[PDB]
Design a protein around this nucleic acid. Sequence first.
DNA 1: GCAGATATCACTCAGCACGA
DNA 2: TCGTGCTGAGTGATATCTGCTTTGGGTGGGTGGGTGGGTTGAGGCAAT
Lengths: 456, 374, 97, 280, 641
Amino acid sequence: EIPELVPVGEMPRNLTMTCDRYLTNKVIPGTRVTIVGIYSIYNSVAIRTPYIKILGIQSDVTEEEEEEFLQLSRNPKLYEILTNSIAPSIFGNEDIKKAIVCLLMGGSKKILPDGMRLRGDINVLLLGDPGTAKSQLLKFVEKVSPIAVYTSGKGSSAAGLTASVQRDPMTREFYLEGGAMVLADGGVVCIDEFDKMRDEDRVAIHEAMEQQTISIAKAGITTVLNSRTSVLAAANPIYIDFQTTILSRFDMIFIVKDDHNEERDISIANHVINIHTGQEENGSEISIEKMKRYITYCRLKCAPRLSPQAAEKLSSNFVTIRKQLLINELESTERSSIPITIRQLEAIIRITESLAKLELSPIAQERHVDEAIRLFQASTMDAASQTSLSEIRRFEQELKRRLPIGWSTSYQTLRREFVDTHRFSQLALDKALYALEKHETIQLRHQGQNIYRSGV
Amino acid sequence: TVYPLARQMLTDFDIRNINKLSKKKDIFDILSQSLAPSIYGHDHIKKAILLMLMGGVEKNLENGSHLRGDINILMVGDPSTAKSQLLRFVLNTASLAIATTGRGSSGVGLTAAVTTDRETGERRLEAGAMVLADRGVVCIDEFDKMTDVDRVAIHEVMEQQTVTIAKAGIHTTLNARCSVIAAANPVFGQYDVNRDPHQNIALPDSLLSRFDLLFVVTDDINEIRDRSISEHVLRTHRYLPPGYLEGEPVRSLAVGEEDHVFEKFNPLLQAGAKLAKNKGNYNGTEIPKLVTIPFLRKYVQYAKERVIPQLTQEAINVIVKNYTDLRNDDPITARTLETLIRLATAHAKVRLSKTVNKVDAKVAANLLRFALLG
Amino acid sequence: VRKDPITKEWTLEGGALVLADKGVCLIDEFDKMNDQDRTSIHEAMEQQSISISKAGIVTTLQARCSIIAAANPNGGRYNSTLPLAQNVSLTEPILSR
Amino acid sequence: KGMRELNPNDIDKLINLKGLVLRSTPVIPDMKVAFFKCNVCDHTMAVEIDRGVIQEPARCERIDCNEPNSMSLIHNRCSFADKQVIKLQETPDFVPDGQTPHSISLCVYDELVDSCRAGDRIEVTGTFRSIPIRANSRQRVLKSLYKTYVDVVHVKKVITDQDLAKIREVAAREDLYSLLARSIAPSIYELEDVKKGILLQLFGGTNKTFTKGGRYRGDINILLCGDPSTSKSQILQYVHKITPRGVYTSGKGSSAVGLTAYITRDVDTKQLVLESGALV
Amino acid sequence: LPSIQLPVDYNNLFNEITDFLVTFKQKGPKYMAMLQKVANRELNSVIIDLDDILQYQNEKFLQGTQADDLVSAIQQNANHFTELFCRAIDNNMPLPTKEIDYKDDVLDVILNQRRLRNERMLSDLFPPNLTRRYFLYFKPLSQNCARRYRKKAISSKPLSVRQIKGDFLGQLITVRGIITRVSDVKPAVEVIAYTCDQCGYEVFQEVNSRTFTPLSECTSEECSQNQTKGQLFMSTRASKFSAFQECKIQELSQQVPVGHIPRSLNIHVNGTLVRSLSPGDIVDVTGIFLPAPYTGFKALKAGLLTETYLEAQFVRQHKDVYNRLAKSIAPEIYGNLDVKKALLLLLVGGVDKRVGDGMKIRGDINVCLMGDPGVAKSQLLKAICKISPRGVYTTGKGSSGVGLTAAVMKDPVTDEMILEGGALVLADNGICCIDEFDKMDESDRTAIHEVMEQQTISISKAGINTTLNARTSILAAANPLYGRYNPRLSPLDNINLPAALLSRFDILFLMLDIPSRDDDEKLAEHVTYVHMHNKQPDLDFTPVEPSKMREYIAYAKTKRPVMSEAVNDYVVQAYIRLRQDSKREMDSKFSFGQATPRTLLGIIRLSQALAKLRLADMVDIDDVEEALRLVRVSKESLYQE
DNA sequence: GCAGATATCACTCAGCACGA
DNA sequence: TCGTGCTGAGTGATATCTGCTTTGGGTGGGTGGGTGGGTTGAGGCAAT
Ligand SMILES: Nc1ncnc2c1ncn2[C@@H]1O[C@H](COP(=O)(O)OP(=O)(O)OP(=O)(O)O)[C@@H](O)[C@H]1O
Ligand SMILES: Nc1ncnc2c1ncn2[C@@H]1O[C@H](COP(=O)(O)OP(=O)(O)OP(=O)(O)O)[C@@H](O)[C@H]1O
Ligand SMILES: Nc1ncnc2c1ncn2[C@@H]1O[C@H](COP(=O)(O)OP(=O)(O)OP(=O)(O)O)[C@@H](O)[C@H]1O
Ligand SMILES: Nc1ncnc2c1ncn2[C@@H]1O[C@H](COP(=O)(O)OP(=O)(O)O)[C@@H](O)[C@H]1O
Ligand SMILES: [Mg+2]
Ligand SMILES: [Mg+2]
Ligand SMILES: [Mg+2]
Ligand SMILES: [Mg+2]
Ligand SMILES: [Zn+2]
Ligand SMILES: [Zn+2]
């Protein structure tokens, strides 16, 4: 039954239905339908099980719409209107808006005859402090996309995402049931609260996005499923479990920080008050229905590819980025963390194709190149950038010297000795402790509240 | 009927071809750089990987003692140094391989472990990755993500070369003779030169000691190298599925059943292989005599199944002298002696000779010296 | 989840939050709850809906209720000098909500 | 004979077994003499049972009344006997190569019922019987494989005035304290005070039943703490042998629950039961 | 039932079989003598060797009187020739020569009374299998015999459970595999005997299937002429039974194709072959591959699929002394002569365990090998631990999940707390073999004291309050986690083992690896000569053979020496000197080897070990002085350096 | 095809009255 | 005083008939097979 008609405090009721011949394979789960049929009863004290015999299906789901869409694509500010339609109710965060648009459109698929087919989908990471409308952005992304799944990381588990091997009760045979990603194949999965999700589920997601084919083929069966999907991740601030490796897997990293400008604060206050007290749609925005059909059309029809001049320009851009770090490393002994990685290079590509597909442009021109360069620079380089190892060396030496073999001291006591004394920051405490524990020289006890040495 | 959708039977002239290549007194470089020709640099790693692939003679003493004769290699380095690419290439060129990553190896476990049904409780010994690579190779990935259970299992597996299960009323012994190649990123995300490799990795000396050779590789930034890598990676993206309007929505006949040996130069694929013969000189235009992978597999097959080199006095004087020089002069352990003999026999197998000669011992000693001191 | 004695098909019960839709959900000794239970209420606090996946009965339930919680500060007393962050063990998100 | 040496040749012959009791079923009533009452004339007769079969009558035995098939069994007036089924596990020594020890079922009737408890070593003499197993409940069909069991006829669980006259003689000995302290632990040398303290624990204090309050128990607790190599564990084992009941619990090999009691469930009865810990 | 004309004649084959049992001669005829032995109740199993049949056939053909190929007939259909051979034996059975008892013969009184009654009734029987008291088995055709006479052997050719297909049903074949399950001997009824309460006549019913229907009404001619409705009642005292066992055989690891799982084949054993198969054993079993037709309603609903099994017929089983037996602990290892002597003493397990009025003294010589990585410890450990008939090599963590001593785990299926023993118990009556002794957890760190002191593990956890019996001597080793040892620092400053644990060890060795040109030169040369020729470089002594050394160790462990007052005086004086010496060494904090009565008992144990190696019974001053040197050289060289 | 519970029909026996 | 032919009555054997599953659960198994079906949740205890 429809969610609206469910009385408060009650539960949705289900009804079995049957269709034959040319009425089969006409609907899929999650589609609103209108049914005309016979309400009959079949024997399974003197009760009978009701069911419906379908006679007609009319689900809410030509050339005229093609002409309308083509005329829309001819608008000279299509990119701006599309970026405006993304979360009309949330102020600021324009870069995140553009990144979400790119994610919605996605990147063109790549396949090679040898067997190494490159990824085309796009994933984004939103990592900012509370009260930033990340969840609202994720909700809007879920609603707008034709196929989308909104999942809370902590609410679900490894079974919820990727896939889990279960057993069929009726037949008692081990089978495979897909997770959120499987149900999101060909669409977008909006994962919220990336932090609270368990580490095992995080590595499962790592594999799923790495190969887009959840490989659970064992335990009585050897079946595999495809998980071609785009992941939008919103994570609470780190203040390592959130190691920079998983961040490197993400194409784009965003650190949202509202600046304390009186003008900005008054502007946001006015926007929210206008929301509470409250629609151009005349050349500056488009409703969810039109945008959804637009996304379907552009994803199914156009798969543009970059241009030779654009390719050379992007190669020169990466060269200039490496030279930019070369300029940055004015330090003589200190070493720069990373200018860029090759995975980040691949990330820079496949967003230009997203812009090309947005405008139905068969070949991406230099405009897309510069737009992508600016978008990446405004998100990842600064966030990555947003001595210490030598300090960790001294901290480790002091910890080893302080504790003999077999002697245990409280972790809080060590924090008081060093962190409170300010000789070493807290971020240098957990890192050194993890490095020491991973080598078995130290042991964590009482949920890490007591430190016990376990050898040289 | 059912229509389906290892080893290549050597012919009479294939043996002649392999002998012809063996006689050429440069074949070691050719074989080493034929594998993974795309990768720039890391030539010593390719040499060591081929040596591992061909292994060394295994000795079975009358006392039942079993002297290990299979080399092991561990890679540790900063991100983006083609570690996964090297693993893929050894997987493709190796007769047997299982890329069971060390991080929660869902599917096939790293080591054997009995299992029971939820309701019926049907006990059964499920073989892991190590057991499923007898007389072969296992290419572990992300060795730094292993859990204590896997570490304890692997220590015993490598030390003893066999697994004895004594759980759930099941008592059995399963051979695990194989070779292990693994990659492990540092603990802080970047390799620190000031620290020892045993510090940049966080495994106990017990695990690291089993690996015969340890290689430390760092990502260095050179302008010309950056341009080369960038262009090589870019080429593929513009490369297309030829068949339909270039860059658009992308989509056996029977069951019963000399460019063949050498490889024509390809700038797209080989690339750095030319730099290899140029000895790090980009300007050098020395087209190398690379060999196709299909024939290289035949070469390794023939060498591994027909040659049993025996140590010789001439190589043995230099083995003893080099080991003594290493130990007493610029912690080196007596087990490094085993490495010298193992690699000497492995290299002698490349030269298609039944006796280990001074050249094999000297080259193995040089490779070990590089693997120890930069 | 229960099993229907008539149809023998698994049904799904209502929870504490569900039973109090369009009402109030009072929680006492809030700080004493475990982390998992305290996460179970994060969804109802802001999302106003609870998602369930058991026995192949995947569905979403409506939970639009106000929550009044009572707790005592960590350590047994409120040190007026220190801020509210250290006084109570609840995480910053829930405190903001 | 051993539990692993009983062959078909030894069926229906008197054998001797020894093993460890594993589990015994509750008392089972076994019919001996049946009781029949005529529904018409209310005439009562008792008939015997042979080989587990009731020699039922076709018609009333009276002459005046001969109505056929009018006899009914009065369940609560038939004579009954006692039956119990025990499971015996062979001694661990007999196990050849460390496998799961075999088990043999036993049947005991009348006096021998409730004679052996669970977890006891017994020697049983009985007849090694064999009996068919029905393939299904609703047919006379039988399986070809016969069930083997033992019909027990004897069970052996493995003060006189003269002794009292003898015991009273020792008490008169002036050096009784030294004699007992020296005999409790013959091997231990020059620990007379420790031995004396240990001995007084075996005897124990005096028991007092006390209303208007609580019972007072005369139980003595002794701690033996000292240098390692001294005979501490040896005395522990020596006393452990003498006492009729006791558990040799160690350090780090016992748990808080393990010492007192463990809450569990009985699979056979499907009820919540509790086990006895080391202290209990 | 349409009929076919098969090219096999059973009358001729039966005649040939009858001639075979009375003419063959590998002393009179072999099988005639075998039957004569059976008639005297001395043998209860006649084994027909198909090699003999082949020899007889070839002998007949050579003479020109060619006959049918009996060997091929037997293998193609074996279930039928058992009956033929049994019938031939019954027909040609000889009269007994040795006076038989005939006293307690139930099926002799029954038959005599049955003959008397039948004769009296007729004047005015029993099935043949009932009287049989022998079992007939077939021995496969050995490959040597087949190649000798130019024939191919199908029965003896070993197969695997994978290759046993439906085409082989009803033939005599051999299967190679490992037994993985055995069942208790149970009596399978062959001929049931009933008694009529009216006639006094006995009725015998043959059962040749997995199920049977008991008889109810008497079928005797007495119950027929009188038409009495007598009731038949089963009598197990007169029936016939045969021992029955059901086992499982599984494929070896060398027969499973890649990507496939091992298969199992059921085996049925009847007659005297019972108890010849035990779990965990590699065998070559020859039997008849037969199906097991279903009965009753199950037949209709089961379908045409047939459950098969193997009827076992034959089973084949796949099977200065001190210095010399010391340098042979691991000939490959070069140095560490005194250490090898200590390991030999451990192997002998020298003790004469003494139990008086209850006191028990441990009889196990525990030893530890500390040092730095590189010295040959693990190789020594595995060699010494393979030498013994029983051994268990494990890390300090333990045998998989369960750690060393023992642990109680919740049952995955029954949800019942079950105690599973660890590494120590698996080494009962043997030497446990521990490497990485440092990595023990707290539980084992504390519970290893129990085993070392008293040979038993005691657990009083939730549901289990029993004690595990573990009479195992312990050999342990450990190494620094990161680098080399630092002799200047205390031994406890480099490893996690507590001070108390190291005290209990009888002999403690600190092995050091000090770089040096001369030493490393010889070490490399020795390892090199071994790698070249697989034997020792030095020819001054010949390494003792492995099996002979194991025999010597067993013989030595059999002996039990004793002490005397003369040597007792020496031992007590030495113990006095050792105690006095420690009065001054107590200043060092690492002096956990401080002399205690345990040291006296260890000296006695080592002396008895040396006496055992000499195979003598009386321990002499020489053994005690040698043992005192091994306790001295093990602390002095490993405490002062 | 097989065992068990159930109801159908046919055959033979002890009483009865008359006639010998 | 008595002998025998006719009758009603009641078992014995035999004719048709239904049924041949049945059942939730791991001391019923997986060579009996999934078209015969089995879809928890709190509380206690060892490991640490
Ligand atoms: N520019 C903005 N316009 C409107 N709402 C905004 C804006 N920035 C933040 N918000 C706030 O975002 C809220 C919804 O998003 P929410 O704060 O839950 O995201 P979040 O920061 O991811 O949450 P949390 O970090 O607590 O899990 C709204 O109540 C809202 O007013
Ligand atoms: N020598 C090289 N020549 C060419 N390309 C190289 C070379 N070294 C690294 N690369 C590039 O590095 C890219 C990243 O490779 P890969 O993802 O396997 O890195 P990795 O270091 O093994 O990763 P991780 O840090 O995630 O463990 C590859 O696309 C390859 O093109
Ligand atoms: N005296 C020796 N003779 C022969 N080989 C030796 C000798 N000393 C050392 N070696 C060699 O030293 C190598 C050391 O490896 P090994 O397996 O013995 O490790 P280990 O350091 O003893 O072990 P662990 O520290 O894990 O207990 C072995 O190959 C052994 O052959
Ligand atoms: N006074 C003594 N009498 C008899 N035996 C002794 C004496 N002192 C020491 N011992 C011997 O020394 C050993 C001490 O071991 P043990 O009793 O286990 O010490 P603990 O239990 O205190 O660790 C015993 O085996 C015992 O034979
Ligand atoms: Mg949120
Ligand atoms: Mg990588
Ligand atoms: Mg003690
Ligand atoms: Mg070791
Ligand atoms: Zn009556
Ligand atoms: Zn009869």
